[PDB]
């Protein structure tokens, strides 16, 4: 359906672009470079991998292609793996902001700019394992499908390249969505709350660090709410696939609006997160006026002339 290959393709862009943006405002502000933001640069380079590399492969997936099994299980596990890279990079930059706020004092001596490269190294260790967990043996191609693979005119040694075709239900389940998102979840959850919480008794105090607590939870609330709602959807989805055999599909309208929205935190996340911070902001006006006063000086010019005579 081109209705949702065009939406998905737009998404990629956008995740390009607000993440592109995010990099380059790190390399031309000098006052951006610190640990703190190696974490944002992380999430971010993902977040590019996903609109140039992910969803190009799960625009493929949707069509049902004549390719060798293990071939498409390979695209959808690669799929697999550059989402949970975005994911575990989003959740590395809440677990800095929690020592940030819980820890302040030595936090400049615990997270230096050696071991947030060891953190991130983590996060792509963890995402290549899971991700690729599907290639080792747990992936439906021991049972083709050859009634779809006539159906589509592939030939022998070949099958209808769908995701729900080669990559299992019960890896999606219990692997899965456990692994990439209820726990990163939970855990930023978990983060926020004790943010919020921080705030509370400084509040309770006034009564009787402040600002930067309250912005941080705003800043980490907004982080977790968009997660929720990009990446749950899908999974519950997923979830009623897995317990309900003899349901009738859920309708794959629907299938193609989860699949988009779970795309659709690499443009949120964690672009609006640095969108929070002024010093990215004032850099990410110095980048996108250079691009009006010089992408609009070619019909500027022609103004300025044909009103001139
Ligand atoms: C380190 C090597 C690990 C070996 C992995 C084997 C575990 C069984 S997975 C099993 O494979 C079948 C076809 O191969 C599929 O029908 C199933 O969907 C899937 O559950
Ligand atoms: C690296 C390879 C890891 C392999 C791990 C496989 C986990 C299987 S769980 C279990 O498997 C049963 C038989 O396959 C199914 O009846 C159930 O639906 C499912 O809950
Ligand atoms: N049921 C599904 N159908 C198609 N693609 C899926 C499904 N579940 C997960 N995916 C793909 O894997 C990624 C991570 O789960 C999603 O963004 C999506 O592209």
Redesign the pocket.
């Known amino acids: 359906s081109s209705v949702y290959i065009t939406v998905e393709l737009a998404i990629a862009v956008l995740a390009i672009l607000g993440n592109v943006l995010v990099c380059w405002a790190v390399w031309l502000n000098s006052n951006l470079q610190n640990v703190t933001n190696y974490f944002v640069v992380s999430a971010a380079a993902a977040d590019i991998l996903v609109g140039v590399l992910a969803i190009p492969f799960a625009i493929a997936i949707s069509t049902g292609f004549c390719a060798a099994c293990h071939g498409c299980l390979f695209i959808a596990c690669f799929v697999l793996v550059l989402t949970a890279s975005s994911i575990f990079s989003l959740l590395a930059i809440a677990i800095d902001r929690y020592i940030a706020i819980r820890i302040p004092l030595r936090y400049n001596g615990l997270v230096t700019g050696t071991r947030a490269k060891g953190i991130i190294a983590i996060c792509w260790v963890l995402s290549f394992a899971i991700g690729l967990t599907p290639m080792?043996?747990?992936?439906?191609?021991?049972?083709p499908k050859e009634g779809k693979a006539h159906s589509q005119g592939c030939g022998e040694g070949q099958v209808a390249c769908l995701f729900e075709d080669v990559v299992?239900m019960?890896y999606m389940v219990y692997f899965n969505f456990f692994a990439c998102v209820l726990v990163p979840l939970l855990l930023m959850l978990g983060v926020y709350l004790r943010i919020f919480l921080a705030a509370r008794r400084q509040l309770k105090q006034m009564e009787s660090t402040l600002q930067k607590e309250v912005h941080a939870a705003k800043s980490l609330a907004i982080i977790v709410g968009l997660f929720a709602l990009c990446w749950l959807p899908l999974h519950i989805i997923n979830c009623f696939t897995f317990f309900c055999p003899d349901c009738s599909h859920a309708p794959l309208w629907l299938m193609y609006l989860a699949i988009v929205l779970s795309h659709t935190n690499s443009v949120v996340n964690p672009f609006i997160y640095a969108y929070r911070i002024r010093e990215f902001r004032q850099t990410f006006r110095k980048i996108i006026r250079s691009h009006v006063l010089r992408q609009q000086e070619p019909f500027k010019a022609a103004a300025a002339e044909n009103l001139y005579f």
């Open positions: 080792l043996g747990w992936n439906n191609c021991g049972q299992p019960n």
